[PDB]
Design a protein around this ligand. Structure first.
Ligand SMILES: Cc1c(N)cncc1NC(=O)Cc1cccc(Cl)c1
Ligand SMILES: Cc1c(N)cncc1NC(=O)Cc1cccc(Cl)c1
Lengths: 304, 304
């Protein structure tokens, strides 16, 4: 028992981190097989970031201008190409520590672990959710660019995020591993609106099921609701509307606890309308939305 | 910017995890050099756990009864000994993945990362604090015994905790790597009182400094206090009394923010007396005590 904001073990990803330097800019790269992936803004100076013409800036660079260092080992760059907002540096050596991996574009509301890195060296690991507005509320400083987000399915690492930038609001934006930004963002030093965010309803419900499994049950009530009624409350409180697809993925937790999904919605409705009354759920005084139903099942069943 | 409950990268510890089976009990072991460390209750059956005589139970075991498997690789056990509540199984092969390491006994209030494991395989990583009452509020299921807690100082892993058991209250107890329990606990299936716990005051103050660094400043007020006055409030609210040693370790954060430690104590006093007023600090609606002053500096400076 107990429920923590647990990250995946980061070892498989640590073995892929390298430092990439181009000119006077150093950031992190991800070395998988014989390719190093990194944010394309490694080719910019500070003056370039106002409105970079990436195609023109990259034309001034040759393979030998990309310095890639895997801790101690220096990699020889034999090709370079830009794909969306990432650079792919072909190296002459396949990473001996390449885990089985996939590149995936996650949906908003899904969770993943981030291995925060600086100068190609891992600093720490944390779990977070991709917000419905496609930002992440990470912990990143200058030099963290190129740090990646990922999930693990037994021996396979699915990389879903590469960090690119911090918005003026202090939230983070980045791309999938094909260099496509999540959200409307562009890799430029310009103030950019992140959409209105919402709370990930299906994850709050999953976390309430995690609370019941772990013995925190005070919020369970004698009520039920309907999807329609619940969604009027969700709209008022800036929660994502709940759909039958969300009810379906909550099925395993409903079955494990014997609490019908709409009865848990009625508990969530009462918590939204009344607050927590100075009480806590799983050590939190707010409704937590960074655990998916899959995360709750994995954590509560001890999947390796 | 941003502030997360960040764990150390777990790769160096993942390389040390093995599965240990003795009879019908399987748990995790830590393979460092040519020794595997694991909880001594691997030698018990369920009937034995009521009141085990560990010396007698271990006398019935020979080296060949301890099955140690490092994923695929089977280790040959050439010696066994019990040290306090841990078994040390000497194996004929030094772990090629042994990182530089130390065994340390941490103080209550200090933090560390836990690599939760099952059957010798890592499941997830999370950061937590050793409570002032020597329990940890972990996330552990049956089979997690032998999972370890650790900190990292550049290339050195300081192992501080090995997980042994879950108390009837759902909190966790374990030992240092010499097998000495933290707290009054014994490795027996008996209800055992954990002391009265308190909130780690110096860590709440460190986290308020982390909040100011990251832009959450609403709780800063026009007041100051004294150590004596603050400690009357700390006593009323079940917080650890603040000492000059705690003020001294908060010095770097006080210097970085320009907020004198006693002025931050006055903000904490007002938060204790008034609550959060439905507001949040670093995404939390309660006062967080799982970040030490060292953690805040490390996270806010990007140490690798
Ligand atoms: C400074 C920083 C922090 N704190 C966290 N994460 C990232 C950064 N780096 C940047 O945002 C630098 C940058 C500027 C403009 C566009 C792009 Cl793509 C990148
Ligand atoms: C069951 C469990 C969980 N959930 C989490 N962590 C650990 C466990 N295992 C136990 O507590 C088994 C045990 C019983 C009595 C004494 C000792 Cl030392 C160990």
């Amino acid at each position: 028992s107990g429920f923590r904001k647990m990250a995946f073990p980061s070892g498989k990803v640590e073995g892929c981190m390298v430092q990439v330097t181009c000119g006077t800019t150093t950031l992190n790269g991800l070395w998988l097989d014989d390719v190093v992936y990194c944010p394309r803004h490694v080719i910019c100076t500070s003056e370039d970031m106002l409105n970079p013409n990436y195609e023109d800036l990259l034309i001034r660079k040759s393979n030998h201008n990309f310095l890639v260092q895997a801790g101690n080992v220096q990699l020889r760059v034999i090709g370079h190409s830009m794909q969306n907002c990432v650079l792919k540096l072909k190296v002459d050596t396949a990473n001996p520590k390449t885990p089985k991996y996939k590149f995936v574009r996650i949906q908003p509301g899904q969770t993943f672990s981030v291995l925060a890195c600086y100068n190609g060296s891992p600093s720490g690991v944390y779990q977070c959710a991709m917000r419905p507005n496609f930002t992440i509320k990470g912990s990143f400083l200058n030099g963290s660019c190129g740090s990646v987000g990922f999930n693990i399915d037994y021996d396979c690492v699915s990389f879903c995020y590469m960090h690119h930038m911090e918005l003026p609001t202090g939230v983070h934006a980045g791309t999938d591993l094909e260099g496509n930004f999540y959200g409307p963002f562009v890799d430029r030093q310009t103030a950019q609106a992140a959409g209105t965010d919402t709370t990930i309803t299906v994850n709050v419900l999953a976390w309430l099921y995690a609370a019941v499994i772990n013995g925190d049950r005070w919020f369970l009530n004698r009520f039920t609701t309907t999807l329609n009624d619940f969604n009027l409350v969700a709209m008022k409180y800036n929660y994502e509307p709940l759909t039958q697809d969300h009810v379906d993925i909550l099925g395993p937790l409903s079955a494990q606890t014997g609490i019908a999904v709409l009865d848990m919605c009625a508990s969530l409705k009462e918590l939204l309308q009344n607050g927590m009354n100075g009480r806590t759920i799983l050590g939190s005084a707010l409704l937590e939305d960074e655990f998916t139903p899959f995360d709750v099942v994995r954590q509560c069943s001890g999947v390796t």
